[PDB]
């Protein structure tokens, strides 16, 4: 009911910076935008309300776009969609390492 | 307990593992380069009612 | 009573409409039927002679949010006659 | 069977009257049968590892991921 | 089959169009591919530490090796153009050899400092050691040491775990246009920097922490801080310039 | 006595471990390498690591903090 | 003749002044018949000396020994803007070899004309000889030599007066065993580090400055005007089918005369020690192994040794190879397994360190050698480091790797008793001691 | 003492002057004569030869720099080529650089054998040059099959680039070492 009414985002995380692999893509996911979040006035604990807390990128998963969309337009969230950045295979060569630089100007 | 080299000097060097395996969720830590740039832990804390003295 | 004679007499014996899909494994042997025949493949598979299933060692759903049918109902059977277990499995959505 | 108990000798217990008294009187004899497998084990108990040895799935030893590269990154991997 | 990570294949002209096989399939690519780029397209992803897509081919850490069909040698797939009715094989037990082979050269010198390093939880490194080689360490003899090198403030440097991949190097001639980094030294104890004293100014310097494949060259500021197991991470844009 | 230190250390009556492991004087190497295990036994200590000494400042290990000089050059 | 293979007459050697008692500069090359009628062999034209060289049969002095025409016609017919380039390898950093050393020092014009030569052959318009660092007095000789075919008009425009222009330029390295590898030679002759590149591309496509380029012997240079003067079935009538030619071989060791000796191809590695270098130190009984040709080749015991021939088919055969014809000659009294260590140990510090194979293997390998040395090790260690090499060869950017691998395979091949009593001997002395 | 890195010194630090004298200027324009103008790079290890023969047979950091001046490269380049080869000395030698401890086909013939008695009539040890700065003793590096072996090498910087001389001496003893020091000390060419 109160949480029904709530906008997500669906998305397909895209791959980390850190790491050549690609093992990680083609997974979509909800993300619930929990951002509310403080700090326990006792030992500094990271305190939340929010019942969507981690639940998007712990357990909720889906193998493509449209099972996310039918998911959500079925529980009734209000959903935007973020198409993910695909790289561009280029033409690459290990000759153009030694190109010839011409006849000097 | 938290134990230390016969120098005197801190043992844990803020690796995290424990945190990641503790069953329970039971150890919080921050970290960051000390003053003589070692890495070593601000903060661990073992909240001892959620442990479940696994020793893992 | 070995899974090899259960997935061959089964599959000459049972109602055809009754089975979707068979699969023999060492993981355990499995049958997936549509709602409507659950039932009846059960009272089979308890009653005849050559399976004689008679205990219900458990049922249990799994979710599955990517399909159309979430839902997946396990029935989890042995039988004490033949010293044999036997899967069978059918899908549900929430209504 | 698993493990081994095909390598064991124990006797199962049955009632015949189906009650109670026939429960407490097998749980009895199974305490005892327990206790004859018990020193079966101790007696047929061999030497050798007691992890299984795939390098992929068990912790390697304290003094080797101490000592080697690939159990150190075992060792951070598993745990 | 969905090429590696959804990577999108342009073609100027179909008649400029090869085909090769990888691992039996038939896969088509553009003229002048390389063999690894005709492996992504199958959807084969083939270890590597000194490629990189945005970098000069250097085909050096040999950790890409497969076996192609009547050749003699595994081939260095990185490197090597694609030609028609190659047959390219990328789980035999020559290529599985090979690598579990370079992978103990790699490990052999390498510092056992995974728990205090950085790139703990997100390294190439422990990945392919626990895919490819899960061979037990054989190397009893002394590692060599590095001694950290100065880069600034920006940039942290534990030379022992550097792999001589030479990424950070082609980066700085190739994208960051500041020639500050080098190759210095010859054999085993070649030693990646600036030979002077010197900060890199660039500022572009930052990338050379997320091409760097080991935890050689990281981040100063968040050094120590997080593990990267413990973040949430979030997808969005920088407002720092008109660039987004 | 540092920043570091006092977001843990509440208690000034001991020295903290940064102060007592720099009070420990530099041991003194025959050779450009030296490894550290951290304890006379290698199984109680840390993972073994090799450390070059070819600069002038004391090399430290990044493990217990054990600091490492070149006795003659 | 075609049973046997030795005794090479003085009027069939190609280097008539190896032995320096003779001018080696221009009068004295004229008088011993260089630059003779150079005028004419470069007007029959590019596709002439292509055909004879071919027809000659001579194949790469250099190591390899890739046959030379073929080699020569990868050179592209038709310029597509770029220019064409011929390199001679006069970098040899191999232990034991001089030969190239001895060209350049007696013979110079031979390689100046060799130079020209080969650039028509080529169609190159300028040829750079790559000359070991080192080598400061040859260098200057040389130069001397080009100074004076410049001056004479045999080098430069119009050279020889045949309306092709070739210039010859001299360059050298800076003490780098890795530089003498045809692409790590290229890399340096660029100004950067002796690092090998990988093939594809060939040098042949793109080379020196990335054009059409050929990296070559300089004892495969030296002869073809040689060869195409006297003609290529003269050439030919020596040595095997396959192996033919006349060939620079150099003994060094335990021999009783160590010598540089010009001889024919395919002579009996025996008889040529028996017959130049007064055979074996302490009789041919005292012989324990033989390097063959340069320490990139395995080692071949004396069983082997008694009846192969030196040749690239025959020492192939046996698991060895002709190399740079650098014959190693040991005896009774040496460790071999002390030779395989330095051996292991000069791999280890030559390696470029660019691919990781090499970089890593080679001193694993060392330290290995080093412990079997004195059999601080176990015996399935030997094992190990059979896998080791295996795991280096084959997988390196270049053929460094493959010559750090073969001196240790060769060893365990060969000797594997003498590391298995090395080992239990230190174990018979650690029981009892301790 | 080698290593792979710079430390800034009074004799060696970047900010001395070093350029190629008049004298040099002729043999830096015929070197860059041999190669196209847009490939200057190729003179790297000419030019780094050059300049050590005029720095007294050694090569501050300050002559790298001017070298990549000329071919107009990065310095790191001129680092690289500087520290690839080992036939570069990046600290001081003496005006005579003797070079001995040959590798494996001499000490085949006990080629380790030479080195001592040359430090011990020298009063220093390896690297390190003599209070009159005429003798250092360093690395041989080998060439050949080491017949005549003992063998070692003089590298003469004492007259720069015009005075060079780069020559090996055969069945050197610990006698006959002496005697060429002392011929090298007293200005005559040793007999090679
Ligand atoms: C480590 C290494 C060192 C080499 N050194 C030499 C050398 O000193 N001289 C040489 O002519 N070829 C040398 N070669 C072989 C060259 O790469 C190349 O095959 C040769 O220049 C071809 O000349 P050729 O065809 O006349 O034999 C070496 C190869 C390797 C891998
Ligand atoms: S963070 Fe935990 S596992 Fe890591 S060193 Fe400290 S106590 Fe040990
Ligand atoms: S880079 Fe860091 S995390 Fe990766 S293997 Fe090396 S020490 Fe371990
Ligand atoms: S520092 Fe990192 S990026 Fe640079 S060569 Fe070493 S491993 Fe490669
Ligand atoms: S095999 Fe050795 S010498 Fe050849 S490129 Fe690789 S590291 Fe360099
Ligand atoms: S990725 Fe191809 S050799 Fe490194
Ligand atoms: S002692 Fe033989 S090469 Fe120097
Ligand atoms: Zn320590």
Redo the contacts with the bound molecule.
């Keep these: 009911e109160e949480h029904l009414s709530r906008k997500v985002i669906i998305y397909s995380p895209a791959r980390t910076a850190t790491q050549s692999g690609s093992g990680k893509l083609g997974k979509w996911k909800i993300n619930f935008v929990s951002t509310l979040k403080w700090e326990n006035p006792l030992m500094g604990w990271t305190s939340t309300g929010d019942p969507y807390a981690n639940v998007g990128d712990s357990a909720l998963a889906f193998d493509s776009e449209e099972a996310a969309k039918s998911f959500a337009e079925r529980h009734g969230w209000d959903y935007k969609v973020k198409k993910p950045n695909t790289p561009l295979l280029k033409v690459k060569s290990y000759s153009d390492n030694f190109k010839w630089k011409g006849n000097p100007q | 307990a938290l134990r230390r080299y016969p120098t005197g000097e801190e043992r844990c060097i803020a690796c995290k593992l424990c945190e990641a395996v503790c069953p329970a969720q039971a150890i919080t830590i921050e970290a960051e380069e000390r003053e003589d740039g070692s890495r070593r832990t601000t903060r661990y804390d073992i909240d001892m009612t959620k442990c479940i003295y696994c020793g893992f | 009573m070995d899974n090899q004679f259960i997935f061959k007499y089964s599959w000459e014996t049972l109602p055809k409409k009754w089975v979707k899909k068979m699969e023999r494994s060492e993981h355990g042997n499995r049958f997936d039927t549509n709602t409507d025949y659950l039932f009846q493949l059960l009272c089979f598979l308890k009653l005849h002679t050559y399976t004689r299933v008679q205990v219900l060692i458990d049922i249990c759903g799994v979710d599955y949010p990517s399909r159309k049918r979430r839902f997946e109902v396990v029935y989890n059977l042995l039988s004490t006659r033949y010293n044999s277990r036997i899967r069978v499995q059918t899908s549900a959505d929430e209504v | 069977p698993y493990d081994v108990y095909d390598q064991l000798d124990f006797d199962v217990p049955v009632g015949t009257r189906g009650d109670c008294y026939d429960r407490y009187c097998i749980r009895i004899e199974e305490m005892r049968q327990s206790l004859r497998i018990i020193v079966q084990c101790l007696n047929q108990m061999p030497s050798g590892m007691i992890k299984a040895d795939d390098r992929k799935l068990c912790p390697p030893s304290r003094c080797r991921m101490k000592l080697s590269m690939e159990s150190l990154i075992h060792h951070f991997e598993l745990y | 089959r969905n090429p590696v990570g959804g990577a999108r294949v342009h073609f100027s002209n179909p008649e400029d169009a090869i085909e090769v096989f990888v691992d039996g399939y038939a896969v088509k690519v553009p003229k002048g591919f390389t063999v690894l780029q005709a492996c992504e397209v199958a959807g084969v992803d083939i270890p590597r530490f000194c490629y990189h897509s945005r970098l000069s081919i250097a085909g050096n850490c040999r950790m890409c090796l497969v076996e192609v069909e009547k050749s003699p040698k595994p081939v260095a797939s990185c490197a090597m153009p694609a030609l028609p009715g190659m047959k390219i094989k990328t789980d035999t037990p020559i290529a599985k050899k090979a690598r579990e082979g370079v992978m103990e050269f790699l490990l052999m010198n390498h510092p056992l400092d995974c728990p205090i390093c950085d790139q703990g939880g997100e390294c190439d490194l422990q990945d392919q050691s626990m895919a490819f080689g899960s061979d037990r360490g054989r190397f009893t003899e002394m590692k060599r040491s590095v001694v950290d090198k100065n880069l600034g403030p920006l940039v942290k440097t534990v030379m022992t775990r550097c792999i001589q991949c030479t990424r950070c190097v082609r980066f700085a001639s190739e994208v960051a246009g500041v020639q500050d980094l080098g190759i210095l030294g010859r054999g085993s104890g070649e030693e990646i920097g600036t030979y002077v004293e010197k900060l890199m100014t660039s500022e572009l310097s930052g990338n050379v922490i997320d091409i760097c494949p080991v935890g050689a060259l990281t981040s100063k500021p968040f050094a120590f801080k997080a593990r990267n197991w413990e973040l949430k991470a979030t997808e969005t844009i920088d407002v720092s310039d008109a660039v987004g | 006595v540092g920043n570091h230190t006092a977001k843990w250390m509440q208690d000034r009556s001991k020295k903290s471990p940064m102060e007592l492991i720099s009070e420990v004087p530099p041991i003194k190497v025959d050779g450009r390498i030296v490894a550290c295990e951290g304890d006379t036994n290698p199984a109680l200590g840390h993972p073994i690591e090799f450390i070059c000494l070819d600069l002038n400042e004391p090399a430290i290990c990044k493990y217990c903090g054990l600091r490492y000089v070149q006795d003659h050059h | 003749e075609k049973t046997h293979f030795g005794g090479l007459k003085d009027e069939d050697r190609i280097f008539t002044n190896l032995y320096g008692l003779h001018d080696p500069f221009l009068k004295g090359a004229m008088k011993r018949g260089d630059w003779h009628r150079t005028k004419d062999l470069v007007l029959k034209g590019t596709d002439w000396i292509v055909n004879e060289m071919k027809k000659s049969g001579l ?8 046959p ?1 025409g073929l ?1 020569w016609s990868f050179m592209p017919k038709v310029s597509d803007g770029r220019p064409s380039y011929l390199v001679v ?6 232990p034991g ?1 001089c030969k ?1 050393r001895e060209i350049m020092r007696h013979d110079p014009h031979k390689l100046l004309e060799g130079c020209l030569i080969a650039g028509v052959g080529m169609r190159a318009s300028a040829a750079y000889i790559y000359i070991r660092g080192e080598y400061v007095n040859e260098r200057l000789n040389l130069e001397k030599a080009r100074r004076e075919a410049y001056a004479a008009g045999l080098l430069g425009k119009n050279a020889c007066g045949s309306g092709y222009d070739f210039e010859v330029y001299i360059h050298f390295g800076a003490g780098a ?2 530089c ?6 290229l890399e340096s002759l660029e100004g950067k580090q002796g690092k ?1 590149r990988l093939k594809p591309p060939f040098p042949a496509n793109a080379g020196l400055y990335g054009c059409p380029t050929t ?7 030296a002869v073809s005007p040689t060869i195409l003067r006297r003609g290529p079935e003269w050439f030919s009538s020596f040595g095997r089918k396959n192996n033919a030619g006349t060939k620079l071989f150099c003994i060094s060791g335990h021999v009783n005369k160590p010598c540089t000796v010009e001889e024919e191809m395919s002579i009996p590695l025996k008889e040529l020690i028996e017959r130049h270098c007064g055979g074996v130190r302490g009789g041919w009984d005292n012989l324990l192994a033989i390097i063959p040709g340069g320490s ?1 080749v395995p080692l071949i015991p004396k069983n082997i040794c008694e009846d192969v021939l030196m040749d690239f088919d025959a020492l192939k055969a046996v698991q060895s190879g002709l190399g ?1 014809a650098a014959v190693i000659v040991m005896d009774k009294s040496t460790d071999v397994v002390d030779a395989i260590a330095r051996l292991s140990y000069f791999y280890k510090h ?1 390696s470029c360190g660019q691919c990781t194979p090499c970089r890593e293997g080679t001193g694993w390998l060392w330290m290995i050698m080093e412990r079997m040395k004195v059999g601080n090790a176990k015996l399935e260690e030997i094992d190990m480091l059979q896998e080791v090499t295996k795991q280096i060869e084959g997988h390196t950017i ?3 790797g493959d ?1 750090a691998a073969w001196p240790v395979q060769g060893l365990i091949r060969h000797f594997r008793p003498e590391l298995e009593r090395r080992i239990r001997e230190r174990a018979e002395r650690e029981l009892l001691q301790a | 003492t080698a290593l792979n890195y710079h430390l800034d010194s009074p004799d060696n630090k970047p900010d001395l002057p070093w350029e190629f004298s008049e004298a040099n200027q002729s043999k830096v324009k015929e070197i860059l004569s041999y190669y196209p103008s847009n490939y200057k790079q190729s003179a790297v290890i000419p030019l780094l030869d050059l300049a050590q023969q005029q720095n007294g047979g050694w090569l501050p950091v300050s002559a790298m720099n001017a070298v990549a001046k000329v071919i107009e490269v990065a310095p790191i380049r001129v680092y690289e080529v500087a520290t690839f080869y080992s036939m570069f000395n990046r600290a001081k030698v003496g005006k005579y650089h003797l070079l001995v401890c040959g590798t494996t086909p001499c000490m085949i013939r006990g080629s380790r054998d030479i080195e001592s008695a040359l430090l011990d009539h020298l009063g220093v040890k390896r690297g390190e040059v003599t209070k009159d700065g005429l003798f250092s003793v360093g690395e041989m590096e080998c060439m050949g099959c080491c017949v005549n072996a003992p063998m070692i090498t003089v590298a003469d910087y004492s007259n720069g680039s015009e005075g060079y001389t780069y020559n090996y001496f055969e069945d050197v003893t610990p006698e006959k070492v002496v005697e060429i020091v002392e011929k090298l000390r007293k200005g005559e060419k040793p007999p090679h």
Excluded: H, M, Q
């Design positions: 194949r790469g002095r250099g190591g390899a020994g890739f030379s080699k390898n006069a970098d040899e950093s191999e070899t190239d065993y890795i003498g590898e045809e692409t790590a030679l090998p990296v070559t012997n300089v004892e495969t240079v990139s740079t030559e270049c053929a460094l010559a």
